[model samples]
Every structure is written in structure tokens, then in C-alpha cells.
Target chain A: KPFSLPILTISELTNSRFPAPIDSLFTAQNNNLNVQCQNGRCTLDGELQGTTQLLPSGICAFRGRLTADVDGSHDDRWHMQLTNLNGTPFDPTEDVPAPLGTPDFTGLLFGVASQRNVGSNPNTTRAHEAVISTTSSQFVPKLGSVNFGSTSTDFQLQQPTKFTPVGIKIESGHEFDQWALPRYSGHLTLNMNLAPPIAPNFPGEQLLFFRSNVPCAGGVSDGVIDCLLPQEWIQHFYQESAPSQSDVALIRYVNPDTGRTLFEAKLHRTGYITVAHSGDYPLVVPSNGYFRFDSWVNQFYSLAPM
Target chain B: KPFSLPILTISELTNSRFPAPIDSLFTAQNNNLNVQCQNGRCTLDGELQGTTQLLPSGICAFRGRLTADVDGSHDDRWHMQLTNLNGTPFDPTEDVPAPLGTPDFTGLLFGVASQRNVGSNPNTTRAHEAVISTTSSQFVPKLGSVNFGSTSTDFQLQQPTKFTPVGIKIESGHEFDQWALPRYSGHLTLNMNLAPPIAPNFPGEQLLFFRSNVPCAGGVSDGVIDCLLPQEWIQHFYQESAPSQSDVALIRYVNPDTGRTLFEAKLHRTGYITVAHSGDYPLVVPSNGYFRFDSWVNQFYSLAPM
Candidate 1:
């Protein structure tokens, strides 16, 4: 009624498939996103190939025909409609299950709490405890669009459109600002296995989650959930990893019907986030709000929405 | 006159080098930025290699011994004094040579103006001519701080410091974060080659520049310089390249002594940049401010700084 846009996830944005293919000869990266002498001619007609080759989420899969062509004498275009979804006929009212949970733009989905039993200080000898927390909601700005919930399997291009990665321009031809328009070999449809809604919205919990975690911070606790284990698990090897800008997750609420931005938060800059739970598993509910931190974290920060 | 930090270039920030080394065994990327079982213990000693190993700007070179040690029980530290600079004694009033220009964070240096002598259209014919523009100034935001101009080389840490890549946090311990403090293999000094100031600030011009270019934009000309080439050179291969988030450059002026962010601009989002010239070398001067573009770049956006 308002706007007609697809509700499917993008392969290139989600951590699910990085280095999305551009055509027969290129993979998108800082190095090769340029137009070179492609066999003496720079026609980008047949090379937009990788989005369809990606592994989809449980609810979505690449299955349909997409048309590709030149927009004017100088531009490119790609168009498709909702047709088949992972071998099943597309439906407008029926829902597709997201048992494991929706995929975030980056792959790292779990956080573990850890404290050593023996330290250089006397107070450090307490507990060798740890806990791991996984997610159903997101933390960063939305890479492309909303994950599937209790929505219909079918939707169409109210009007076919262009999909550009965030921070990229569509019409510019400068190499640094240029992006080669992709051409579909057939009908192009991006499918994903998104997560179901929390509790009342779905039949049950998606039991699948991050079973392991990289240890949380010591000294500071801002967005951290309060959880601890016995001195027994202190020896559990925890990983020390930090995300590059690309690896960080962001959350945005989009109007699924129009794919318009309802709320887009600036990227999280200063601190990290955490959730409360026991060492076995976290009580992560997409419906429950999260805590936002300012300056010092161990102090409970503001509550962030799902 | 204002601050007390050193007036030098950072080797890690410029287009001079990407993928700077963290420690001995780890090179940064989407993969392996985490702390794993590093030879049994996770002490990040002796691993911050690379920055010092980089090729410096002709004006600056790695010298001085920097000290690396633990900051508390949990943090890391690196300290150094202005010592041996590329084998020459340090100078406070004298300047280092910049026959070449200062380095931008990404490696791509030149921009070429190109057009087909004969196109599908009747108005497409022209002579083969092209001109290249190199930089004494910058386009992207400051990756770290102000580059060397007509500043003194001999300086010191007004208040010792921490250097980080943009968009990164210093204290968080998330795997998506979790930067390990580096241990210096020896006295750690970051050496860099820098450019001389334009005109009255230095001697004659530094002849180094983009002798080659990936042609300018076709339809849109926001931030683009106007130049033309003859149809004879249209057949000369022009690259269709674009900058990834990392490769994009931004300009900022900083008090080199403090490494403080004086005026930081957001990364350029919508369009590309260009300079004006003819097929012969153009009369380009960082001092003779250029035009800036609004939404329609060809009309002129805004005049950016040197």
C-alpha cells in the first residue's frame, strides 16, 4: 500500500557472504573495484555474478529470474521479482521459519565473561569463572535491511530499484566512487535463513547459538552483563579479539514494506556492549532491550531497543 | 609554538602502507586480529613490527629508540625520543627534505582526465591529450595527524601518547576489539618521509606525483577538476578504480606536537574529487584553494583546505 520493496537480506552486507563476486573476473575489495581493460572493452554486462552464489539463511534462498541491462548509454541496471524461494513457491501471507536466529552483518555473535582465579594481587584469587552470551538481536547499524520476522514469504518491487552498499555512490564514475552495476544471469533473488521472533511470536526458541566466546574485559564493565563462574573455569582459553570497522555490528529499523529507514543510529564509537546471564547460556531475548554505556561501562548504561 | 608533540608523519596512516604489522606473528585483517593461544601465553611482547619497517617519506625516516612495556597489570605502553632519524642527527629549527610529497593513507596517488576521441555520439571526437595531478595537499580526512610542512623535525613528546587507527577503541576487550599492546623489538621510533610546504614554505617543487591516473568521472563532476585529452589517447587504457572506506582520503590540520585532533572532517560520502588542468602539467597549487561542490558536484561543493 505505501511502498513496494523486497524484504530479503543482502548477501554482500551480511557476514554470511563477504567478498561478494562482481563478475566472471572480479571479487569486490579495496584493490579491484575499478574498471580495467577487460579484454580491451570495459562493458560490465556479464560480470555481476556473485550475489546468487552465496549461501542463504534458512528462510531465504536465491531462486528466481533477474534481468540485467544498460540503463542509458553509460549506466547499468538489474531487475527481479519475488518468484521461487529455496525451492518452495513464494507466498504473501505465510511465514518462513528462522530457527537459529537472524544473521548480523558480522559473524562474531557471542561474548564470554571471564576472570582469573590467580592474579598478581590478593583480591584476584577469587573465582575462575566464565559465561558466554549469544544474540538474536543486533548491535550495529543495519547493513541493508531488516531480518525476517512473522512476515510473508512474498513481496515484489513496488518499482524495481538499485541496491548500493552503505557509504557507496551509484552514479559516479570515479574509481574511488565507482561501483560496477551487477548483471543477473537469470532471475535474481536473494534468500536468507533469518531468525524467528522471540517467544510469543514463534513456536519456540531457536536453540542454535554461540557455544563459545572470546573473553570479555577485565577492570571495566559498562555494557557487560553480570555473570560469573567458579574458580574451576579460569583456565578456559578465551580469545582476545577486536573488530575492525567492517566487523562491527549495527542495528537499524527499516519499514519492511518500503525498505526505508525509520531509525538509523550513528555507529557505536566509544565502548562495547554486554548482556546478563549465567555461564551456561545467556537470557538473550530480542524483545528485551539492551543497555547502552557512556564513558565507564561496569555502571549500567542506557537501555537500547531490540 | 603551541604544542609540544613532535612534528612528523606517521608511517602507518598514509596511503604509504596498509596492513601494518601488529606483532611478529600477526598481520591485521578480518582474520587473525584476535588473541589466540600465542605460544601458550598472550603477552603481546615483541610483535608490533611493520610500522618502523615501512618505507618512509623522503623527508622522514625511522630513528630513535622507543620503549615498550606494560601500562598497569592490564595495559601496554610504547615510548620513544626524537633520536637518529634516517641516520642524520635530529634538527629542531631545520626541516627534513620532501622532494616528494607527503603520503596519504591509501597508495593511489594520481588522477587522470580522459574521454574517448570517438564515442557512440557525434560530439565525442577530440584530440589525444591528458594531464596528471599529484598532491602536495590531501583529500581524505586526517588518518592520524597533520603531515609535515615547513615544521621543525627535532621535537619531543609533550605528554607521551597512544597512536591508533581511526574508528578503533583503546581499552575495550571484545574480540571484535581487543587490540594487544605491542612490545618494541628495541627502542621504537616510527619513521616517515614527508612533503615540503607549497611555495614560500619550502624550496622549489617536489617533482614526485601521479604520472598516471585512473580517468575522472564521466557524467558527474562533483569535486572533479576539468581537464581534457585528445582522441588519440582515448585508446590509452584508463582504469575504472574506486576507493574502499580505508583507501578514501580526508584532510585535517593538527598540532603535530600533541597528536590532538584539531579539526576532523567526516569521510567523503556522496561523490569523487577532481582538479583542473590541461594535457600538459597543470598549474596546480595547494595554496590557490580549489572549488567545492554541493549535491551537484560540477557546480562546486565547497573549497576544502590544504
Candidate 2:
């Protein structure tokens, strides 16, 4: 069993003399904030908060929650916001300086969680957003500034535990009951929790969770046994979002040796997301070599369309 | 999460007054004692135990535990023996009608739970065995006749939750990443606890744990999507025993249209099951079809040259 991050979202509003409407407030996008694994284990710790922002047209206000955890790890940037202060429009900004002496009006509020990645590796820049509906507060600034909250959401990296067989074609000299140089091929259907969807501005058709070369161990060479060769196992995923009109989807095990496709499919729904398709291609392996099928999804959404 | 049977073995002996020399005293063959699943849940209760016997020339004695629980379900016949009673070899029989008081040093033993078929659709059987090295008078028979103890063994039916891709070839115009009639394929590697070994006189090389047919939900039909078909999924297992000296393991995905094997393989050890010849034969599928993979092995030995 691997460690997973808890979901981050505002459970309730605390303060009583709040001015903002409760309905419009929500959390920021937060999905696939998976823990980084080292030798089959993951340990993380950090603080994150949703950016406060103004709703569309500045008619209503919305703001995300601020949260912190001792074991937090993620693949993308964090953002949140607050909006619509004192019946007026508000702007969004990252990192609001702490300690406000006193303003015209301040609304007691809660935050939520959602999903969105700022950019890619190396050049990828991290961003955090939080804002106040109005620059001024009519009440005294004594209830304490908003701090990062803790989330118990079940975070996970999509991975396969088993597979199915269908419309499959095997090749070369391999018999099911005979013992020889172990080379087997078949299609794999991947069933896992769909990743969280990206924001409207996020690019790409799907997120690349895993991409690497695997070594095939133990194969017969000439008349000898125990030969090894480098093989490939790659996969990518798209979190489905009904509001975004995107389906949960994936493409896996694209064979490089013979340029063959293994398995592929997609489902319609998961615990938090909806999709049209998600499955895998093919998985090819050598007979004598040893290969443990294992992987996890930990990446950001593309900044482009599929 | 699914239910699994616990391992049945004396990892350590606790009682000291027992007449048996822990080594030679053991249970008879126990296999296929499985939990029945309804809507993905297993709840079983029944009684089972081993037959007490005088090892070889009565130099050593061996027997299984006598146990019983309320609501048991499985597939197969049950067998148990009660011998070496009153310093004499007892006969063999099945299902002793309840209510027997002090019959020739009955030892007043209370049988417990082991492996038995409780009354599922298909009539099932049960078995058990138990013995003491040398009958003793110091120990109270009230300790409840050392009933056949239950085994907390880990037993699992190999059912795939997902699949992986490899070198695969498809037919009937199904392509990767496109949604048509939902077609896919892949290899499933099963890892589970091996069943207990049988006695020398037991027949059959393996025990059948699961055998059933699964209906493919959606497929292409006359160019229409979402058709159904009754596909088959059958399986049996042979717990490897050093005395058995045969390593023949296979995974066969048979096609219903032509009764041909869609995918097959013979491996040595599970972690490293070998194949004199490893690799796949041709796997062909229907233009419009669906498929699922299932199987299991409860035996103990790692697949190798017995």
C-alpha cells in the first residue's frame, strides 16, 4: 500500500458576523496532488491555500480555503481567490500580506479545493492565489487572518493492479502450456480513479503520468537461459470533467519493437470526475526476463488542446 | 476490498500437555475451501477438520483441526477422517449425524470450523481431521477435544481489477484511443497463496476453486453498439508439492467463437514461474465482442521442478 494525500477542502464557515453570501464561495482546483515515492514509499509535508477570486461579472463573490499539512506533495502549482466586496467588483492577486490594521469591510468565509497546474518541469513556476472581496473592512480586524487548513481528501496516483483479455492477438513462438523462452503479449484494460480536471486555460488533451523504459529480465539466449533486454512501458491520462466537456481517458503500452498498440478504453465516471473514455494499449514482455508491473500518475495537465 | 481465507498452519504450538510430537502431527489435505461472493462480499460459516491417523507404522501420528462456524459457502466435496481412537485405527466416513454421547472414548471433542460448503445453489461438501500423539489422562477432555482449529490462511480467487498492454494486433476495425463498441485486451499475472497439499492417497493433481462464465456487457452487433455475449471464465489450481515434481502452469484465454485460445502461457514460479518455452501463440477475436479474465491457485509450493 502506498501513501496518498488527503483531499483539501473547506468543511464549514466558522465566524458569525460574516458579510459575504455562503452559496457563491468555493475551493480552488486540486487534483493529483500525489506524494512522491522513493523506493516504494512517499513522505511529504507543506502548506497550501486556495486563491480568493471575484465571480464572473463581479455579481457574486467566491473565495477558496487556506490549508496546511505535514505530508503534502504535488505535481502542479496552487491557486485560490476572493471576490465581490461591499457590493462591488474585486481583483485577484497572489500572496496577500498578513496583518490588516482595519478596513472598510471584511467578510468571514471558508475555502474549497479543486485542480490546476501552472506549468511544466524545469521552467515550471509555482503560484498561489488569495484575495479579499473589498480592500476595506467595516469591522475590527481581530478574528485572525486566514491560515492554511488541513484536508482529509483521499489523494491517489492512477496505477493498474490487474488486467483483462479481449480481442487479443499474440505472435511468435509461444505456447500457453509449454515452458520456453517467456515472451507474452496481450491487451491491458486499466481501471483506476480518474485524475482531477484542469482549469479552462490549461493546455493539452491529457496529462502524462508515466513515461520510462523498463528492462525485461530472464530470457533464453541461443540454448542458454537468463538473458536481458531493455523494453518500454509508457502511459498518459486525461481526467474527465462534465463541466469541461472532457472525458477521462488514457493511452498505454505503445509497442516500439513492432509498433503495435496493446490496449485502450475510457470510462464515464469516478469518485470526483466524469469522462468518456480511459483504458490502455498493449503490454509486451520476454519469457525468461523478470518484470514487475507497477507505476503511478504524477504530472501536470498540458497547456494545449488534445 | 474482498474477503480472503486465512492461512491454515501451526506457525507455533502453544499447549504443552498435548501428547503429539508437534512435528509428525499435522492436518490432511485442505484445499478449495473458499468464501462465496454475492455483490462482492463473502460470508461463510461451517465445520471442517483433519482425520487423525497413525503415521507410517504408528511411529508418529498426524491429524487436522476440527472447526465449525455458522454460514459457509464454497464449491467441491469435503473429506475428513477420525482414526486412532482407543489405541485403535478408526474407520473413515463423511458427515457424522449430530448427537453422540461418550461413544468408546469419544474424547468429548468439539469440532470447529475449517472448510465446508454451506448450502449454496450447488450442493457442496466439507472435511476435517485431528489427532493426539498418545492419549493422556492428565489433560481434561473438557479442553473440548482439541477441535479442528481454523486456518487464517490467505486464499484468493484470481480476478483482474485492470490490465496492461503489450505487442498486440487487433481486427474488425478497432483502433486505439477511439471510442467504438468498447474492445480491449491484456495479460493478467496472478499472485496468491497456494493451497494446502493433499495426502499421498488423494487423487487428482489439483483442486478447482472457481469456474464460471461471465457475460460481456457491450460489443458491436451488425454495426450497432452495446451488444452482449456469454463468455466463459474457468480455472483450477494445483498447489506445488516437492513430491509432485511437475511444473506445468498455464493461463488460457479461450475464444467462444472458435474455441481457440486467445492467450496462453506456462510459467515456473509465480515470482519466477518458468516455461520450457515462453511466448504467445496467435490470439484472434471476433469483430464484435467483449472479454474478462479470472483464475486462482491456493496451493503452497512455488512452481518449479517438483
Candidate 3:
């Protein structure tokens, strides 16, 4: 049977079982994705503490293993954390409202037996390769924790990757108690809900994006975009707010096997351009032929495989 | 003999001088041009001053009338004074140098006089125009007294209009002997040396210019220049000084009729022009015509007037 679009939806399920489970972090099974994860530590022999704790929380979640001294060097090698998402408050229309609390373990996933890490380098394990099953483990950690409590309230994904947000979790500690009271915790589970990587060639809109923006310099103004409103609703959605805010342009192009993003600066109005920050290799696109460019926009655009 | 083409080459007269018997404050014969003046206020009516006070020690002799109201209100007038220009040290090459003192006067000329009332309309005997002079009148007081002691000295006229040291007299006061030393007192006779009133037929090559730069709202970088130096010889003349300190421009033309001068500004390489302070005006010459302009210059090339 063909699955419905948005195969995953918010739901609540409860059951009483096993090891006197005080808490069971549920991997969201709504929509089309079945997400499962477990918190574990990596060891020289692979990973220790496999499936030791499986708590269910009424939220979507992702996982990453923190391996301290995998080589027994005492240096803590923090395995990249899965892209955790918050679902509870993600329903912008309903405004479920964010919860307040310490984020630690708030957005837990349903339990699954942790497997050994896989990597070409035996000494260093592929921390992301693990078996999980609210349904699958394909949605495990690939990047380090993209969001940090001290950085910002909204969890931002470590970008330049194709991870989408289906869940959301926010921790409103101390000062924010009034807005998100109870000061305990809040979390959401996100199901990648993606179609099995689409064979890497099935063409679709390649949405390229990044958070934060690079500021404009020289005579070029900054970029501004209003994420709150619908793009079509604005007079000039692409550049409306860009000239003043920090401007970061994310150039994305797709070929057959891979997609690329080349970051460069907004061209200077005075015909003088300072060198871009190191590592930003500007794409060699005809000045007038690249993706539609709005000087005030600092976000994503795409180039299809012509 | 008729003047030759070279105009008798005065050789710049590093320091020109006119001998004693000069009117203390009287204008020279060929140079005087009358401007209606009034009242009891003493104007530096003459262009030159001669004193019995000798150079380096003694003073030359001079006599002139100082006529003006002792006090008045409608009097908005002043006298002119001189000093070694461009911060150059004074060297009158006199037997007795003028006493080193703050310039008795500055941009504004001043003197003693009486008036009818503090706020009286057109008060005093003088008309709205105050008539001041270096002249000594029955209505004027003696400049002062001076003791040459033993040396014979004289005050002469150098750059008459410009009060260079060569044109002034130095007087020591009675206190000369008070501090184990002697001083002299006397008025330095000044004779007026007026140049023809500048007329406005054409702006001379050295006329003041105003430049209104563009990009309207910023500060001006390079300041106004007094003259545009001949690029070739300019370097040779200012070679010893740092580029910033000594940029000198040469004068190629000045409309003798009008004091206005015409010159060019060689801008610095940086195109940064401040537009706030100055506003640019169209060149005084007519535009939209094809004509040659070399006829106006010395090494003339003529084109039919367009």
C-alpha cells in the first residue's frame, strides 16, 4: 500500500512493561518514519552499554554515542550526536507551547539493541552505524550535536547536510521559566520520514539551506529574510529583510551523483569585492545565470541538473 | 627705455626694501587707490611704515596721522597687521630687529578711539565708514618715545602689502633699564602701499576655488589647495620635505584686473572625496563648444573662437 504524505503524525501510545520502566522514551512512529535510538558509549572493542536503558518519552528523538577514551587515551572523543528534533511544539498552527526544563535526556527514543560500530578504520568506529527499531536506525547520528543549550533556544541542525526537522525540543532553563514553566524538560522526536535516500538520482527539488548568516561587507548590503511568513505573501520575499541582517548565501547545485553548495559573498555594489572567508570556494557561475539571486536574501536556492 | 619682454628681471628680490622717509602709514605714490572711510578710528591707512628705529638696535623715522573717534558703537571696523608668513622666521636684516612680541594685531585691525555713545546710531563725527590711519594727527597721540642710546637705525618697506619684518619697526619700552637693561619706545611710522583694486573681468589663475565632491553625505578628504604646483618643478622644489608636509603649487596665471586666480588641483591617488563641506560648481568657462584655449596661456596656441 502506498503511504500517505506526511506519513508521520503526532500520536500518544502507552503501555506498562519491563524492568519497572520509570520512563520510556518513545521514538515517534507517526507519519511514515519509525525512529529508534539508544544512548551508549563507544569502546575499543566497539561500543559498551548496548541497549542498557530504553525509556519512552512522548516525543521524537535521535541518538549519538559518546565514546570517551575509545583508545583508552583518556581523551573523550564525543561521538557525533544525532540531529535531535522537537515535535511537541513544532505544530506552529496549534501552538502547543514549549515546555521548560533541563534538556538532559528529555527527548528520549524508544529502546533498541545497540550494535557494533562500522568503519573502514577498525580503530575508529563508525559511531552512526547502529541498529534501532521503533522501526529503523538509518536516522542515527551522523553529525555532532548541532544545537547547544548555551547557543540558542531553538535547536539548529548542523547544516550543509540534508537533515530535515520533523520534531522539536526546547529547554527553557532558569530565566525563561515564565514562558515555559515547570522547569523540568521538553522534547520532540523527529522521524527523517525520507524515502530511502531515493537511489541518489531520483530528481526532486534539492532544497539547500543553512542557518546563521555571513555579514555583508564593502559596499554590498546585508541579506534579510522573514522565515515567519509565507514567501509568496511578501512583496519581495527573497530580499525583503536581507539588506540589514547578516547575509549568508547558500548556493546549491545538483548533478547526478552529488549536490554541492558553494558559499560566496554578495557582490559589492561598488565593483570592489574583498576576498571571502577562507574555505569558501565560490562557484564559477555566470554572473547572470546562477540561481535567482536577491541581494537581500542570505538563504538557500538551488540549481537543477540541466 | 621701454621695458623689455622679460620685464627687467627683478630677480625675486629675496628681500626687497624701500629706504627711510617713507610715510609711517601712508600708501606709496603709484600704488594708492582710495576707498571712502570715516570716523576717528585709526585704520592702517598706509601700506608701509618707516621708523627711525634701526634694525637689530635702532629705529628709522616716520610720521603719519591717526584719525578716528575715541569711542563709538556703530563702528564695525578694524586695522590690518602683518607677520612673517607661512610660519617663516622673520629676518628684516635691519641694524635693530623689531622687538619680538605677539603680533600687535592679527586678521583684524585694532586701535584706540572714542565714541559718542555705546549704542548711538551712527555715533561720533566719522561717517558709517570709519577712517583709520597709521597717520599721526593733532587729533592723534604720539606713538611713544624711544632712545636709540647710540646706534642709528631705520625701518624700511619690504613686501609692503604683506607685513613682512622688513616693513615694520621694533620699539623697546622705558622698562629697558628697569631689569638691569634698557628699553626704547616709539611709534613705527607706517606708509600705505595700496595695490590696484582687483576687478572681476576674469578669475585670475590663483583665485580661491570651491570643490563640491559627490556621494553627497561624507567628509572631504583632501583640503582646498592655495595653488596648483607645476608637477615637474614642484617635486624639485619640495623634494627635501616629506610628501605630506611639502606639496607646493606654482602660480601660472592671475587676472591682473580681478584678484581671482585660476589653478588646477592634482588629486591624490585615492579617489576618496568628501562631499559634505564643499560643493562643486561648473567651470566658469562656457561648455558645449569646440574651441582652442591655448591663446590664454604663455606658450600660446590659438584656435578660432567657438
- Per-residue lDDT tens digits for candidate 1, residues B84-201, read 2222334433332211112222211211111111123311211111111111122111121121111122212222211111011111122111123211111232222222111111
lDDT tens string, model 3, A9-117? 0111111111111111111112322211122111111111212111112112233333321223212122224322221122222211111111212221111111122
The top-ranked prediction according to lDDT is 1
Better-scoring candidate (TM-score), 1 or 3: 1
What is the DockQ (computed on Cα atoms) for candidate 2?
Answer: 0.01
True-structure lDDT of candidate 3 = 0.18
Query: Measured against the native two-chain assembly using Cα atoms, what DockQ does each of the candidate structures obtain, in the order listed?
Result: 0.01, 0.01, 0.00
- In candidate 1, stretches whose alpha carbon ends up further than 4 angstroms from where it belongs are A1-68, A72-192, A195-306, B1-46, B49-306
- Fraction of the true interface contacts (Cα pairs closer than 8 Å across chains) found in each model: 0.00, 0.00, 0.00
Q: Model 2: per-residue lDDT, tens digit, B1-306?
A: 211111111111111111111111111123442311101011111111111111111111222222322214311111123233222233322222111111111111111112212234211212121111111221111122221222322111121000111111112332211111110010132211211222211232222111111111112111111100000000001111112123322434345567664433332221111112212211233322222222233333232211
Residue range B1-306, candidate 3, lDDT tens digits:
110011011110010111111111111112222321111011111111222111110111111112222223222222122222212234444322232221111111111111121132311111010112222121111212111110111111121111111121112221101001111122344312211222112212111222211000011111111111111111112211222211111122233345343422211111000111122233343111111111112212221111
The models' CA-based lDDT, in order, is 0.19, 0.18, 0.18
Badly placed stretches (over 4 Å) of model 2 are A1-253, A256-299, A303-306, B1-306
TM-score of each: 0.19, 0.14, 0.13
Docking class of 3: incorrect
